[PDB]
Amino acid sequence: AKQLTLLGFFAITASMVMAVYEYPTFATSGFSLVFFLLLGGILWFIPVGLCAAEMATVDGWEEGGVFAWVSNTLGPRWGFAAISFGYLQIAIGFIPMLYFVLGALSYILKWPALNEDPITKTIAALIILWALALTQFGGTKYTARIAKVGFFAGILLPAFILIALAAIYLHSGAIEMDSKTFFPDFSKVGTLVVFVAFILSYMGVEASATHVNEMSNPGRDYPLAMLLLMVAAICLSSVGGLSIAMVIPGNEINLSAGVMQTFTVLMSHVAPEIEWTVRVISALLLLGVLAEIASWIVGPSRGMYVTAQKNLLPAAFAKMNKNGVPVTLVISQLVITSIALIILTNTGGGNNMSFLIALALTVVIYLCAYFMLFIGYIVLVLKHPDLKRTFNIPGGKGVKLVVAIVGLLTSIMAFIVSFLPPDNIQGDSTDMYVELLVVSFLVVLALPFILYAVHDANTGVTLEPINSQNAPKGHFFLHPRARSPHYIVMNDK
């Protein structure tokens, strides 16, 4: 007995439709971004959600996450490594936040040294990270809550204030030319590498797929959620990613504090009288992000305990303190994020390069997890056709293949394109982009593959799937990339 209206689903993963942080670096590509979101959604997004779902709704596969899906078609070795890119990609994916944080931070305090100064960013980055790390440790009773209050408060609220700020400003006066800048210049070197920010925008969906089952009539109900979710995300990202763009042109947009910058600019027009108001908006931005980050600190390692229960994970990488919160991982990833935070930022050209690079690294890591999803999916399609699926991509072995084949392509393309800069991401220069990024990525691709062989007597607890019904307060106000799916019921609780 399970019923989930198409809108019920939308509401659940609708939470990702908002990626303000990256709004600045979507703007760098001027007007093209509507193009780019179109690709993303049609060639990637969709396909991803399409295949991910069919795999989720398979007899015995609902409780998996593509540790499940993959480990059946591509086999074990592949599920562990693939499922580790749900967790790994997020260690790097943190950077972006920390920068956005410091960017807002800086604008609040008339301290443009928080963004600019790399030496100060690092020290300031960890301070904020390992602080949140602390709090979260104090049990995750709160997270969910704060997040529901936070994302409301901050990520949601400024958006209205931007639309209204940009829209009214566009009313009269004046910066990017809307006519035909629509297509990126394949004329120039770095033109694509931006995609990264756009693919990132869509990654995550695989999370809320299994949510399919509870659904009520996957058939249409579902390809529609996507159609609407994709359209909604494009509209939100298009209106925002552009606002900033209209009032700052491509060369000098600040990647991290780029958002607050747009407000300070658009405001200095509405009536300098309330120019300070912008400072207040920054506080809300930093708040929303802080809440979203704090929710990440704990979550995806819980997502990743399934590997431990199967021994897969080291004998030492399995322990939770009164109230769950397995800590070997949480504290472990924190080091990777901290160690990486001291490498990327405190290293290359300036800042814009450190921000954009962080996205590529996170996207590249996630790409690995996806490649298997598409590859294994086709294995499913073709090696296990006689099987039990609640949701079936609608068309036939054909559409199914061509659909899955397309997405794999889009990924690949995103993977490559990830690796060639223009050398000029608004000043800071990618002289060191392609390398640091090769050694950084090759360094990780390396982790889950080594842990496997390393070594092959059980203990832990039970994990209880979560559903449009359990679901702690305001889970879904969370990002899909990061929600875990199940409570660490130890002591039975």
XYZ file of C-alpha atoms in Angstrom:
493
model
C 0.000 0.000 0.000
C 1.800 3.052 -1.308
C 0.619 6.156 -3.150
C 2.668 9.143 -4.315
C 1.154 11.719 -6.670
C 3.428 13.064 -9.406
C 3.486 16.332 -7.462
C 4.385 14.448 -4.303
C 7.532 13.291 -5.997
C 8.314 16.643 -7.413
C 8.110 18.154 -4.025
C 10.559 15.605 -2.775
C 13.424 16.198 -5.173
C 12.315 19.667 -5.951
C 14.795 20.568 -3.308
C 17.683 20.555 -5.737
C 16.134 22.934 -8.204
C 17.883 25.694 -6.323
C 21.596 26.135 -6.660
C 22.107 29.759 -5.983
C 25.714 29.365 -5.037
C 26.724 28.353 -8.478
C 24.665 31.118 -9.955
C 27.701 33.319 -10.486
C 29.683 30.808 -12.519
C 26.705 30.067 -14.694
C 26.667 33.679 -15.555
C 30.171 33.576 -16.918
C 28.718 31.917 -19.976
C 26.539 34.893 -20.570
C 23.247 33.969 -22.183
C 24.326 30.511 -23.270
C 23.311 29.138 -19.962
C 19.766 28.512 -21.123
C 21.297 26.429 -23.825
C 23.430 24.627 -21.242
C 20.614 23.867 -18.862
C 18.662 22.517 -21.841
C 21.419 20.039 -22.637
C 21.892 19.175 -19.007
C 18.227 18.382 -18.481
C 17.510 16.696 -21.810
C 20.762 14.853 -22.540
C 21.876 14.263 -18.958
C 19.392 15.016 -16.209
C 16.542 13.111 -17.860
C 18.498 10.037 -18.980
C 20.000 9.866 -15.485
C 16.601 9.971 -13.796
C 15.138 7.636 -16.406
C 17.651 4.804 -16.030
C 18.170 5.394 -12.343
C 14.540 4.902 -11.668
C 14.021 1.747 -13.741
C 16.873 0.239 -11.786
C 15.423 1.332 -8.468
C 12.073 -0.360 -9.151
C 13.261 -3.844 -9.689
C 12.355 -6.824 -7.694
C 14.801 -6.764 -4.862
C 16.537 -3.611 -5.930
C 14.541 -0.901 -4.305
C 16.717 -0.842 -1.226
C 20.030 -0.209 -2.989
C 21.110 3.188 -4.269
C 23.253 2.014 -7.130
C 25.390 0.219 -4.795
C 22.512 -2.077 -5.459
C 21.903 -1.444 -9.104
C 25.499 -1.497 -10.061
C 26.599 -4.440 -7.979
C 24.201 -6.730 -9.858
C 25.059 -5.808 -13.446
C 28.658 -4.616 -13.135
C 29.231 -6.850 -10.116
C 30.561 -6.099 -6.634
C 33.944 -4.423 -7.132
C 31.898 -1.918 -9.106
C 29.132 -1.236 -6.549
C 31.587 -0.411 -3.820
C 33.646 1.954 -5.964
C 30.497 3.427 -7.507
C 28.738 3.831 -4.159
C 31.927 5.467 -2.881
C 31.501 8.272 -5.383
C 28.274 9.168 -3.708
C 30.364 9.945 -0.686
C 33.620 10.836 -2.213
C 32.406 13.431 -4.605
C 30.952 15.269 -1.666
C 34.178 15.705 0.150
C 35.322 17.921 -2.659
C 31.846 19.213 -3.349
C 32.139 20.913 0.029
C 34.732 23.387 -1.146
C 32.215 25.288 -3.288
C 30.102 25.865 -0.172
C 33.000 27.010 2.003
C 33.872 29.545 -0.698
C 30.314 30.717 -0.925
C 30.226 31.017 2.785
C 33.398 33.076 2.849
C 32.153 35.146 -0.009
C 28.977 36.125 1.770
C 30.984 36.429 4.956
C 33.256 38.938 3.340
C 30.537 41.176 2.015
C 28.928 41.311 5.397
C 32.066 42.543 7.121
C 33.530 44.875 4.593
C 36.381 42.423 4.449
C 37.280 41.599 0.865
C 40.157 39.645 2.182
C 38.028 36.644 2.887
C 37.578 35.880 -0.730
C 40.686 37.375 -2.235
C 43.255 36.268 0.268
C 43.949 32.607 -0.289
C 46.081 32.381 2.799
C 43.173 33.735 4.843
C 40.530 31.677 3.036
C 42.044 28.342 4.061
C 42.380 29.157 7.761
C 38.879 30.635 7.595
C 37.573 27.640 5.649
C 38.632 24.947 8.118
C 37.575 27.087 11.078
C 34.028 27.077 9.709
C 34.133 23.426 8.612
C 35.537 21.725 11.668
C 33.268 24.005 13.731
C 30.169 22.724 11.997
C 31.833 19.381 12.361
C 31.783 19.836 16.069
C 28.182 20.940 16.354
C 26.886 18.194 14.222
C 28.587 15.693 16.371
C 26.295 16.820 19.141
C 23.833 14.428 17.542
C 21.824 15.006 14.427
C 18.604 15.727 16.358
C 18.578 19.245 14.816
C 19.961 19.298 11.256
C 16.781 18.380 9.380
C 15.022 21.120 11.348
C 17.519 23.967 10.985
C 17.762 23.014 7.310
C 14.004 23.324 6.825
C 14.197 26.685 8.619
C 17.479 27.648 6.961
C 16.837 26.828 3.360
C 13.594 28.536 3.799
C 15.134 31.456 5.459
C 18.077 31.937 3.262
C 18.354 30.142 -0.037
C 14.686 30.541 -0.758
C 14.278 34.105 0.456
C 17.011 35.972 -1.412
C 15.808 34.490 -4.698
C 12.679 36.459 -4.466
C 14.734 39.355 -3.520
C 16.899 38.910 -6.741
C 14.157 38.405 -9.300
C 12.416 41.490 -7.866
C 15.741 43.332 -7.759
C 16.838 42.369 -11.271
C 13.384 42.468 -12.860
C 12.691 45.996 -11.614
C 16.198 47.096 -12.587
C 15.654 45.711 -16.083
C 12.504 47.823 -16.129
C 14.663 50.753 -17.139
C 18.343 51.557 -17.524
C 21.523 49.570 -17.622
C 24.818 44.427 -20.171
C 25.030 41.037 -21.919
C 23.098 41.176 -25.209
C 20.394 38.532 -25.389
C 20.167 38.053 -29.110
C 22.581 35.339 -30.170
C 25.251 34.787 -27.575
C 23.190 31.713 -27.089
C 25.836 29.371 -28.330
C 29.136 29.227 -26.587
C 32.083 30.117 -28.707
C 33.712 26.985 -29.956
C 35.875 29.813 -31.202
C 37.805 30.078 -27.918
C 39.735 27.608 -25.825
C 38.010 27.448 -22.471
C 34.588 27.868 -23.742
C 33.091 24.578 -22.543
C 34.770 23.900 -19.263
C 31.899 25.826 -17.726
C 29.526 22.909 -18.305
C 30.923 21.489 -15.064
C 28.852 23.966 -13.055
C 25.802 22.882 -15.034
C 26.082 19.135 -14.800
C 26.702 19.648 -11.090
C 23.488 21.482 -10.857
C 21.679 18.252 -11.924
C 23.737 15.562 -10.137
C 21.989 13.857 -7.219
C 18.768 12.559 -8.690
C 19.691 8.951 -8.250
C 18.906 9.621 -4.660
C 15.204 10.089 -4.801
C 14.486 7.378 -7.293
C 13.488 4.415 -5.207
C 10.971 6.968 -4.081
C 9.488 5.634 -7.277
C 7.838 2.581 -5.716
C 5.712 4.500 -3.220
C 4.781 6.382 -6.293
C 1.324 5.652 -7.562
C 1.528 5.442 -11.290
C 5.132 5.736 -12.374
C 4.163 5.436 -16.042
C 3.365 9.044 -16.904
C 3.257 10.503 -13.410
C 6.994 10.175 -13.557
C 8.695 11.187 -16.763
C 6.531 14.245 -16.029
C 7.981 14.993 -12.563
C 11.316 15.232 -14.378
C 9.872 17.243 -17.217
C 8.536 19.666 -14.609
C 11.502 19.376 -12.247
C 13.881 19.922 -15.134
C 11.838 22.818 -16.429
C 11.559 24.313 -12.943
C 15.295 23.991 -12.319
C 16.056 25.576 -15.692
C 13.690 28.468 -14.979
C 15.140 29.083 -11.517
C 18.753 28.758 -12.656
C 17.957 30.741 -15.841
C 16.330 33.697 -14.090
C 19.030 33.809 -11.424
C 22.087 32.797 -13.420
C 21.104 35.595 -15.788
C 20.204 38.426 -13.392
C 23.678 38.438 -12.069
C 24.811 38.183 -15.627
C 22.918 41.070 -16.982
C 24.477 43.368 -14.428
C 27.989 41.939 -14.458
C 29.449 40.808 -17.848
C 31.477 37.646 -18.299
C 35.098 38.712 -17.700
C 34.949 40.091 -14.147
C 32.209 38.062 -12.346
C 33.373 36.897 -8.905
C 32.728 33.196 -8.587
C 32.194 32.834 -4.875
C 31.080 36.253 -3.709
C 29.556 36.788 -7.140
C 26.014 36.605 -5.786
C 26.332 39.253 -3.073
C 28.115 41.365 -5.686
C 25.040 41.406 -7.933
C 22.869 42.567 -5.034
C 25.282 45.350 -4.061
C 25.259 46.465 -7.697
C 21.522 46.192 -8.353
C 20.861 47.853 -4.997
C 23.098 50.858 -5.659
C 20.315 51.686 -8.104
C 17.063 51.024 -6.296
C 18.100 53.770 -3.880
C 21.526 53.867 -2.206
C 19.476 54.757 0.879
C 19.009 51.025 1.542
C 22.355 49.941 0.083
C 23.177 48.514 3.496
C 20.166 46.258 3.129
C 22.436 44.123 0.947
C 24.602 43.390 3.984
C 21.527 41.940 5.688
C 20.799 39.744 2.670
C 24.333 38.363 2.905
C 23.656 37.200 6.460
C 20.679 35.219 5.169
C 22.771 33.702 2.380
C 25.551 32.617 4.737
C 22.862 31.223 7.039
C 21.147 29.051 4.438
C 24.478 27.694 3.232
C 25.714 27.024 6.766
C 22.610 24.945 7.476
C 22.969 23.013 4.221
C 26.635 22.342 4.983
C 25.956 21.224 8.553
C 23.487 18.696 7.150
C 26.242 17.302 4.931
C 28.655 16.789 7.737
C 26.969 13.620 8.903
C 24.386 12.282 6.390
C 26.240 10.736 3.480
C 28.488 8.544 5.699
C 25.271 7.019 7.073
C 24.407 6.690 3.406
C 27.718 4.810 3.173
C 27.521 2.453 6.135
C 25.985 -0.304 4.013
C 29.500 -1.080 2.785
C 30.703 -1.505 6.368
C 27.906 -3.885 7.362
C 29.171 -6.108 4.547
C 32.727 -5.977 5.894
C 33.759 -4.307 2.636
C 34.811 -1.245 4.636
C 37.924 -1.597 6.808
C 37.395 -3.276 10.185
C 38.238 0.045 11.839
C 36.036 2.160 9.558
C 32.925 0.931 11.401
C 31.858 2.656 14.614
C 29.049 4.877 15.787
C 28.786 6.813 19.036
C 25.643 6.680 21.176
C 23.126 8.038 18.667
C 24.606 6.681 15.445
C 26.846 9.127 13.602
C 29.480 6.624 12.523
C 32.523 8.731 13.058
C 35.452 7.086 11.385
C 34.005 8.221 8.072
C 32.640 11.629 9.063
C 35.945 12.601 10.677
C 37.731 10.798 7.842
C 36.131 12.704 4.967
C 36.565 15.923 6.943
C 40.305 15.354 6.565
C 40.012 14.796 2.816
C 37.963 17.980 2.480
C 40.352 19.861 4.762
C 43.457 18.425 3.101
C 41.969 19.210 -0.309
C 40.921 22.670 0.872
C 44.549 23.441 1.720
C 45.685 22.198 -1.690
C 43.311 23.614 -4.304
C 42.700 27.092 -2.891
C 46.106 27.694 -1.318
C 47.907 26.839 -4.562
C 46.784 27.854 -8.054
C 46.302 31.146 -9.874
C 43.887 33.259 -7.861
C 40.410 32.435 -6.579
C 38.144 31.990 -9.602
C 40.405 29.111 -10.639
C 40.237 27.556 -7.172
C 36.436 27.686 -7.268
C 35.927 26.411 -10.813
C 38.547 23.709 -10.261
C 36.689 22.513 -7.164
C 33.596 21.946 -9.303
C 35.482 19.966 -11.946
C 37.075 17.761 -9.289
C 33.695 17.053 -7.697
C 32.017 16.531 -11.069
C 34.825 14.279 -12.292
C 34.551 12.126 -9.170
C 30.777 11.827 -9.529
C 31.183 11.060 -13.230
C 32.871 7.787 -12.285
C 29.829 6.776 -10.239
C 27.556 7.611 -13.168
C 29.514 5.870 -15.885
C 28.849 2.575 -14.108
C 25.168 3.429 -13.676
C 24.802 3.830 -17.440
C 27.075 0.886 -18.238
C 25.500 -1.418 -15.666
C 22.058 -0.233 -16.643
C 22.610 -1.405 -20.153
C 23.905 -4.636 -18.654
C 20.517 -4.831 -17.048
C 18.575 -3.960 -20.118
C 20.473 -6.576 -22.094
C 21.696 -9.307 -19.740
C 18.516 -9.376 -17.566
C 15.543 -8.465 -19.675
C 13.445 -11.084 -18.121
C 13.110 -9.291 -14.880
C 10.824 -7.557 -12.442
C 10.565 -3.800 -12.851
C 7.890 -1.571 -11.387
C 8.928 1.274 -13.670
C 10.054 0.654 -17.199
C 11.416 3.302 -19.533
C 8.642 3.551 -22.034
C 9.525 2.758 -25.615
C 11.277 -0.590 -25.899
C 14.755 -2.107 -25.968
C 15.389 0.649 -28.503
C 14.540 3.888 -26.763
C 15.962 2.284 -23.694
C 19.362 1.751 -25.179
C 19.511 4.961 -27.223
C 18.366 6.821 -24.074
C 20.978 5.237 -21.809
C 23.573 5.513 -24.575
C 22.946 9.217 -24.873
C 23.406 9.918 -21.254
C 26.642 8.003 -21.092
C 27.830 10.187 -23.903
C 26.818 13.413 -22.207
C 28.701 12.261 -19.066
C 31.837 11.338 -20.966
C 31.750 14.674 -22.748
C 31.340 16.348 -19.359
C 34.283 14.319 -18.063
C 36.659 15.429 -20.845
C 35.455 18.965 -21.202
C 36.160 19.062 -17.461
C 39.847 19.020 -18.153
C 40.567 21.848 -20.496
C 40.422 25.414 -19.212
C 40.687 28.621 -21.149
C 43.549 29.680 -18.874
C 41.603 32.806 -18.005
C 38.735 32.222 -15.634
C 38.265 35.926 -14.990
C 41.922 36.741 -14.443
C 43.297 33.855 -12.373
C 45.008 31.717 -14.968
C 44.856 27.964 -15.528
C 48.555 27.310 -15.986
C 48.261 24.576 -13.466
C 44.623 23.669 -13.960
C 44.899 20.546 -16.109
C 47.669 18.910 -13.984
C 46.657 19.510 -10.362
C 43.307 18.279 -11.494
C 44.671 15.095 -13.110
C 46.756 14.181 -10.064
C 43.890 15.108 -7.740
C 41.368 13.030 -9.603
C 43.760 10.136 -10.193
C 44.428 10.241 -6.494
C 40.824 9.472 -5.697
C 39.782 7.114 -8.426
C 42.453 5.319 -6.483
C 40.825 5.205 -3.032
C 37.828 2.871 -3.213
C 39.762 0.531 -5.561
C 42.608 0.146 -3.053
C 40.401 -0.362 0.004
C 38.781 -3.275 -1.829
C 41.828 -5.458 -2.485
C 43.624 -4.372 0.687
C 41.595 -6.914 2.671
C 38.373 -8.981 2.660
C 33.266 -11.474 12.056
C 30.453 -8.948 11.629
C 28.903 -6.216 13.774
C 26.862 -3.024 13.516
C 23.122 -2.384 13.443
C 19.989 -2.200 11.295
C 19.137 0.402 8.656
C 15.554 1.452 8.048
C 14.678 2.757 4.653
C 12.988 6.131 4.679
C 9.931 6.988 2.626
C 7.546 9.790 1.737
C 6.210 8.633 5.093
C 8.948 8.158 7.660
C 11.298 10.902 6.751
C 12.392 13.036 9.607
C 11.060 16.489 9.571
C 12.335 18.390 6.548
C 14.539 15.746 4.968
C 13.381 16.664 1.590
C 14.310 20.220 2.252
C 17.677 18.688 2.000
C 19.745 18.118 -1.042
C 19.268 14.712 -2.700
C 23.037 14.443 -3.047
C 23.306 14.160 0.681
C 20.200 12.832 2.328
C 20.947 9.409 3.623
C 18.244 6.844 3.255
C 17.670 5.243 6.627
C 18.058 5.647 10.348
C 20.923 3.916 12.157
C 18.565 1.944 14.397
C 20.988 0.797 17.083
C 19.644 -0.129 20.498
C 16.542 -0.263 18.392
C 15.536 3.376 18.107
